[PDB]
Amino acid sequence: GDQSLEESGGRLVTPGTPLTLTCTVSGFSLNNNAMGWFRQAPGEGLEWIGAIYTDGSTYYASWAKGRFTISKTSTTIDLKMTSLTTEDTATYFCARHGYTYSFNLWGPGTLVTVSSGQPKAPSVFPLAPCCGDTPSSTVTLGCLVKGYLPEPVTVTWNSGTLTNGVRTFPSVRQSSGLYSLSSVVSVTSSSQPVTCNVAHPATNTKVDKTVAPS
Amino acid sequence: DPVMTQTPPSVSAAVGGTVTISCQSSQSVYNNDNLAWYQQKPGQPPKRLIYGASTLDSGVPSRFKGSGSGTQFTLTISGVECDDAATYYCQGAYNVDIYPFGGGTEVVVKGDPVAPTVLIFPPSADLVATGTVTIVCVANKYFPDVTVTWEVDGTTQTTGIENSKTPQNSADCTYNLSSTLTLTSTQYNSHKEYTCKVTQGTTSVVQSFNRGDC
Amino acid sequence: GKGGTYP
Ligand SMILES: [Cl-]
Numbered sequence: 001g002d003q004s005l006e007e008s009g010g011r012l013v014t015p016g017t018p019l020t021l022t023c024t025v026s027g028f029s030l031n032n033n034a035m036g037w038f039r040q041a042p043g044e045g046l047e048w049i050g051a052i053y054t055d056g057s058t059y060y061a062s063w064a065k066g067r068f069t070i071s072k073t074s075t076t077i078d079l080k081m082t083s084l085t086t087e088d089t090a091t092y093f094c095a096r097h098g099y100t101y102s103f104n105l106w107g108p109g110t111l112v113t114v115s116s117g118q119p120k121a122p123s124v125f126p127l128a129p130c131c132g133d134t135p136s137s138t139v140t141l142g143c144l145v146k147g148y149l150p151e152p153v154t155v156t157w158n159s160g161t162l163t164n165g166v167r168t169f170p171s172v173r174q175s176s177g178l179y180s181l182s183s184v185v186s187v188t189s190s191s192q193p194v195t196c197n198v199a200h201p202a203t204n205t206k207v208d209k210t211v212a213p214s
Numbered sequence: 215d216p217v218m219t220q221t222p223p224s225v226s227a228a229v230g231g232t233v234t235i236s237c238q239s240s241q242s243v244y245n246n247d248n249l250a251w252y253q254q255k256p257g258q259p260p261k262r263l264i265y266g267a268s269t270l271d272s273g274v275p276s277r278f279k280g281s282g283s284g285t286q287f288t289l290t291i292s293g294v295e296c297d298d299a300a301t302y303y304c305q306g307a308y309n310v311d312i313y314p315f316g317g318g319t320e321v322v323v324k325g326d327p328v329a330p331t332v333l334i335f336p337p338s339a340d341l342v343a344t345g346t347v348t349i350v351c352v353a354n355k356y357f358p359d360v361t362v363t364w365e366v367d368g369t370t371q372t373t374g375i376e377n378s379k380t381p382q383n384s385a386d387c388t389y390n391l392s393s394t395l396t397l398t399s400t401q402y403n404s405h406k407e408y409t410c411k412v413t414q415g416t417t418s419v420v421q422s423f424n425r426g427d428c
Numbered sequence: 429g430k431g432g433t434y435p
Pocket of ligand 1: 029
């Protein structure tokens with residue numbers, strides 16, 4: 001069978017700006033299943049925000065009441081948020097209630113970034129060993145993806161056809177609020193050229209960088 | 215409004231060992247057993263493991279066992295494997311319309327020791343031209359944890375360093391690590407030797423370059 | 429109206 005959830009709507013938002021997230025459901029009826037919304041702030045714990053029952057009655061965490069509203073159609077639930085502050089920056093998840101009153105199906109999440117920063121595309125730079133290093137049978141090459149906001153970026157190699165020997169590091173947020181990450185790949189030194197493909201959905205920007213072994 | 219408290223915050227166990235996590239509820243859970251456990255790995259949604267305090271969800275290994283009733287519950291992992299490195303959460307349900315989560319327990323799985331391979335990447339000419347240089351060091355495939363130091367002309371750096379460690383590998387428990395040093399181009403151009411030193415217990419591995427060679 | 433068709 002094909003039961004699924006998918007959240008959408010996550011973006012950079014300045015404090016005070018309202019945002020609605022949407023959770024699209026497949027393979028089951030909202031007339032027969034309650035739904036919840038949850039979040040997880042970066043590096044922090046999962047927390048329940050609220051629920052919508054089959055009759056469309058809603059229930060909220062103490063802190064969420066009045067600021068967050070849940071509604072639904074035949075195939076979606078939404079989360080209307082107001083009075084957003086930096087404390088609301090998190091990954092937001094929708095999940096389906098089961099008759100045991102725990103949550104038996106989860107979407108992948110959508111990222112809400114509450115910030116006075118501006119949507120900013122990454123700058124991509126090649127990572128290669130120093131000129132005059134003694135070469136080997138293999139070489140590790142990479143891309144530094146820096147100065148972007150919000151998360152996420154996607155990084156592929158050779159348009160997703162090179163996956164063996166790829167290491168992509170978790171992003172780090174600088175004190176400025178911007179993110180950076182690197183991705184490296186180890187390839188046979190005789191091998192064809194490697195290109196990292198960086199996409200930033202928030203700015204709809206794509207950068208290719210063909211990394212010369214140096 | 216009921217509260218779940220989970221202990222311990224963190225625990226380390228060797229492959230094939232046993233982990234035990236505890237959840238206390240402030241009120242009796244619904245029907246004395248509406249208590250669920252979830253696993254979450256970085257960048258992934260939570261995955262429910264147990265529902266109704268003791269029933270394994272579909273596609274959950276038999277090494278996971280939930281026990282307890284009323285207000286006290288336990289999750290035991292009998293024969294921990296590298297794939298079980300994750301954060302675990304408990305969630306109660308109640309007479310009242312509240313779905314609280316425990317604060318989480320991080321599980322670190324100790325695998326076989328592996329020394330890092332260390333690589334250093336000097337900044338690209340176009341990166342130097344931005345007026346801020348980022349030097350990237352990687353420590354690939356290692357266990358247990360390393361410490362990184364940066365030296366510039368033999369002087370230990372105390373600022374401009376950012377580290378990013380991957381989740382534990384789900385087969386062999388190993389980490390990868392990126393460490394970056396960030397300097398102005400003026401600072402970069404006024405020093406010669408850049409050193410990434412990666413220490414694992416009593417062994418250190420350096421990678422160095424001379425700015426003028428690259 | 430809480431719960432659902434699956435555990
Ligand atoms: Cl259904």
